[model samples]
Each structure stands twice: as structure tokens, then as C-alpha cells.
Target chain A: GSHMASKRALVILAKGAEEMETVIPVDVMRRAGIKVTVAGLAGKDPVQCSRDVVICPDASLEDAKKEGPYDVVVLPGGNLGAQNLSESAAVKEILKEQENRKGLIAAICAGPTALLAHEIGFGSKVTTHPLAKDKMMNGGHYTYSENRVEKDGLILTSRGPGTSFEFALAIVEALNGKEVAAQVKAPLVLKD
Target chain B: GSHMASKRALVILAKGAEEMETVIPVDVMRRAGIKVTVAGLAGKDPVQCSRDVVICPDASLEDAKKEGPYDVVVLPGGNLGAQNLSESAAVKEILKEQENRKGLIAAICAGPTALLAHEIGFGSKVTTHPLAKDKMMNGGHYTYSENRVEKDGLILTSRGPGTSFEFALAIVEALNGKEVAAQVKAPLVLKD
Candidate 1:
């Protein structure tokens, strides 16, 4: 009856998150016409990022989690932010449910370490910030690569802030198709 | 007592500003050890960026302006945001004062169009998002460039979201030298 159903993304926003990584994907996905909810990990109050940039979330994770299941659950990376995400029992439950449903789970930089902490998506090919490689590969649970962005089935991961655009575009392509991704990317004046 | 005094940057935040362009430079400059102030254009309120990302500013431009003059003044671009900047008497005063003092002024995407409207940096070589070219070059006030980041003396400009890292790095290099910029850039895992 319809051409395509709308896709929704849940971007978990925690204190100390990498502001660039968090905003780029949310903005790019919105450009691709995806419904993105930037959910606050702590509550709906503004979350101060690694460099002191404060972002106000649309809703608290406690509230947003009720609206699941989303097309993808996005995790942005900053050392402390990832640790916060990794330590949350609520986050553990969400990741487990998303995984059990075989939905996409995307993380960047130190974010993949949270996947390790939560014990979700093991044995998938992944990539992380070089500094985070040791932590992500400590158990040899998942194979690692140096690719800027890597996707092994529903598990997607990327390096750091510099790779955020590619990481975001990959997400857009995954949810909306290459055509929508390309159309959204054109005006961004990407170098390569 | 110290080899170098700390540098400071003032980033103007307005409703409808491109969140990527705003945050990337702020975060990168902070990484370069430059003190950055995210100043709200209207007042000390949360700004809704072009993509609907809400960013809370450290202070209102009115108050932050009193703390000047900073090493650099950054204007981020979104069509509506730049329009807001272009129409404001406050922004006009700030840009003119910066220009008259020979301070560095960096603008990106549609941001340079505000320069055109406010009558700043009339003869410098500049670049803007491709869609903004005609508006920027309306009276041949500034020569155009296709480079990802363009700088001519104190006026620095860049294209859209993808070139934000390049633009921010260029600002760092200008103020802190290539060595510091390179050092700060290495950990971000940027490709090329």
C-alpha cells in the first residue's frame, strides 16, 4: 500500500560523549529523512560532552526506550561516555533486546567497548579507534579491522570523530538505501 | 613565564545554525588547547540548529561580546542561521570590530554570505558551500575558491559539513602553528 515505511533511530546521548560524532549522525540521518531520537542516558537535562559542549536530548532513555524497537541504536564515543554507557544496566537491557531482535547496532570510536561490556554482538567484524583496539579485542571476541567504517551484518562500527561523516553516511545508506544517502550527501560537499 | 599565552575563540551560535559546523570547530579548537566560548546569538538560550539539534550556549553574545576581543570569531552557517547573523546589528558590529582590530574571523558554508551582507573582508579570497557561491560573489567583493578550506590573511572560510575538520585544522594551524595542529589532529583518526 505504501512505497516504504519510515525508519527510526535511537541515539543514546551520555555525558562526555564526542559532540562531533553525536551530532553528525543525528543531523545526517535527519537529512536522509530518518526519525532520530537523541535520548539522554542520564535524563532529559543537557549532557555536557568531552570538550564541554552541552546538548539537550529530545527525551530520556528511560522514556525513549519505551518506543522501541528502532531501526538502529547509535552509540557515540568518548572515553568516559562509553564507560558510562557500558556501566548502565538500562543500556545493557536495551542492547540485549535490540540484539535479540537482530536489529542494527552502530558504535564509533571507544563505543565498541560498550558492546564488549554489554556482551552484545560478539564474533562480528568490527572497527574502533586505534587507541581503543586493545580494549575491544581484549577477549578476542570479535575480529578487528582498520577500515574507517565496518559493517558485519547488523553490527556496524567506525573509528573516531574524523570518520564520523562516513559512519553517519553508512547509517543513512543502511536505513534508507544508497540513493537516499547519495542525495543527502551531495550538498555536504564531501571531498571523497 | 610561559612560551605562549593561551588562545581564545568565540563561536556564535544561532537558531538554525548547522550543528556540525558549529560543534566541529569548537571541539577541534578545544583539542588544540584554545579556550572556546559558544555564545548564543539571541541570548543565553538553547539554540535549535538547522537539523533541530539543540545546543546550549555558554553565554549570550551580548555578555560574551563584552569579554572580547578573542583570538578568533567563528560564524557557523545554515541558510537561516546566516540570515539571522546577516540581519543582526550586533553581529555586524562584532565582525566590523574584529576586522578593524586585525583579528582572525572564520566563517563556514553559508557563513561567508553573512560576511558579504555585513560588508566584512571585502577583498579577501574566500570559499563557501557551492549553493552559496552566487550570493557570496554577488558584487565581486571577495574572490571565490574551490579548496576545501580557504584562508587569506585574517579571513578564513570553508565549504560544507565534510570540510569542517580541514577548516578547523586550518584555524589551529594559523593560531598555534602546523606542529601543534598536527599533534592535535593525529589522535582524531582522520583519513588524509
Candidate 2:
């Protein structure tokens, strides 16, 4: 039998990003045999996360974006990180491209605010950190949900760091299959 | 009103360590306002974790060991990372010293096996990734439990990645008390 190519993900890493939100998705996706690229938004230097943890990216967003058509585009959230994403023209282009292709776009916590800023994926049901609800729901651009993870068509969003595993697993299920997601989830020993 | 000095933690970062395990505790402890130093086991270089995520440590274990009389010493788990810890003379001495002082020591997944290798904290009830149970019970030196996060006095252990939040919160509770842990846990949006 021929082997299928692994599903690929592009996770945008910006300054002050939530380390837990970023790492959980990257780690969980890898366990599901997905090819995940942790791309630094500000070139290839190590990124200082919200808690001051430094993580070296696999590639700079400038370079990694060239190899696109990823199965999913992931955005992890910290207040400042989301603000940085909101301010980037580059992120705007990337999200727009993914949306135009009808590809999966996933964000967590304050991450959904970036979609709001970029004005992509409007009209989709989304969820964000409880504290970020006001910003995400501003102007009634999208219907808001209190679910831990909410996916409407190509857009998927999750709540805070504690919901990261659920968010990542949903992405896995979307890209791979339910079987792969369940298999991956088993080793994680996740309860509820 | 007088302010209290923050509790400090030492998280050893060895090559092939689980990035999820390492970052969860470090990030959560910081959320709990604990001073956590991520120390590289093999000097001050970017550690390539089991999943190939690169993390730059705050300092080398050599330097960190000198400054420590830390409240808790953390061990992250990957099969090879645990082996690296088990084989280290430095880790042995650190665990021995912490044990002598009755300081809290937390390990997750295969990390608890390192305690077995170092012969520290015998007779305490512990837990590990189910796959690692056989290896941890090789000598029957310690009792095992199925609790997601098992703390028997000074030695704390937890299962796999899913239990990481619970594990980190346990350490937070141990060092900063229940109120701090609850306050920190609220924002994480944990299901359990």
C-alpha cells in the first residue's frame, strides 16, 4: 500500500505568546504524526513567551509561509501575542490565504481576537478566553459560544490554556481522522 | 503590609525531555508567582526535546545547582530524558541533597523512574505513565498509585501529558498554598 503524506500545520509564534497554548498543540499534533512547523513571526530568533520562557522556532514566518498550503494554520494566544498578530500585515495575508482556500484555521484563548482584527472568518461561531469575549464579540461580527472548543466550517477556536489539549485534539481530528485523534488522545491520559 | 519572598523551583531540562512536561510546570509555577529556573542538564545550550522542540534554558544545571536550596526540584519525562537524568552524577547529588532537606521533588511520566535510579524517596506512593509502570516497579522500592497526581509527602508524581496541568497545580498548591493554586487555576479554564 502507498503511504499518505503527513498532514502539515503552521503555528505562528509571536512575542509574548502563551507558552502552554503554543507547545501543547505542537506536541499533540506531532504525536498524531502531523508535520507541524513552529514559525517565528519576527524572524528566526528565539521567542520570549508570556512567562519569559524562550522557544527557538523551526523557521521564520517569512520563509515558512513560502511552503504553505498547510492542512491547518494555528494561532496561540497571550494578550500581547494576539495584539502582535493583530498588528501584522503578514498574518493578515496568511489567514486570508488559508480562509480563501477553505482550509482549517485554529486559534485559542485571545487568539480568536486576531481573526477579529484581520476580519477573516466572520460569521463563524467562535470561542475565546472568557476575558477576551468582549473583544472577540465586538460589533457582532461573529456568534460567540461558551464551549471549550467551537468549530464552524473552516474556523476553529478554543478557550484558555486549560482547553488547549481539547483544541489540539479537534485540529487533529479535522486534519487526520477521528481514529487518529482518539489514538493520540489515549497516550495523553486526558480525563474529560 | 509585608510581602513574602517568592518560592523558587529548579526544572532540569535534559535533551529529549518532554517539552510539554517541562513547559507546563515552568509556565504554571510562574502563573502561581513562583520563581522557576529552567536549567539545562548539559550546560547552557538550546535543548532539543523528544519532539524536537528547541528550548533555551535560563542557565546550566551546573550554575543552578549552586544557587539552589529550592523549594521543589522538577523532573520532566521522555524515555531518553529520564535515562539521561538517571545516568547523571549531578542529578543524583541534587536529588540526594533535596531528599536530605525534605524539599519537594516532582516528576511526571517516566521522570519518576529517575527517582528509582537515584535511590531517592523510597517508600513513597507515586505514579507514572502506564507504559513506565513496569520499569518503575523493577525493584519494588516504592508503592504505586493510579491517582492522576499523587503526592506522598515530599515526592510528587503524575501520569502523562494530560495530567501535567494537575501536576503543576499540585506543585503550586504545595509551594504557594490552596488559594494561590485556585486563583491560578481559574484562568486556565480546566475542565476538572
Find the candidate with the highest TM-score and give its number: 1
CAPRI grade, predicted model 1? high
Q: In candidate 1, how many Å is residue B111 off?
A: 0.1
Q: Candidate 1's error at B66, in angstroms?
A: 0.8
Model 1: per-residue Cα lDDT over A1-192, one tens digit each: 667779999999999999999999999999999999999999999999999999999999999999888999999999999999999999999999999998999999999999999999889999999999999999899999999999999999999999999999999999889999999999998878
Q: How well is each residue in B1-192 modelled by candidate 1, as lDDT tens digits?
A: 787779999999989999999999999999999999999999998999999999999999999999999999999999999999999999999999999999999999999999999999999999999999999999899998999999999999999999999999999999899999999999998888
Chain B TM-score per candidate, please.
Answer: 0.98, 0.98
Model 1: lDDT equals 0.95
Model 1 segments more than 4 A misplaced? none
Writing each residue's lDDT as its tens digit, candidate 2 over A1-192 gives 545558899999999999999999999999999999999999999999999999999999999999997999999999999999999999999999999998999999999999999999889999999999999999999999999999999999999999999999999999889999989998888996
lDDT of 2 by residue, B5-119 (tens): 5899999999999999999999999998999999999999999999999999999999999998999999999989999999999999999999999999999999999999999
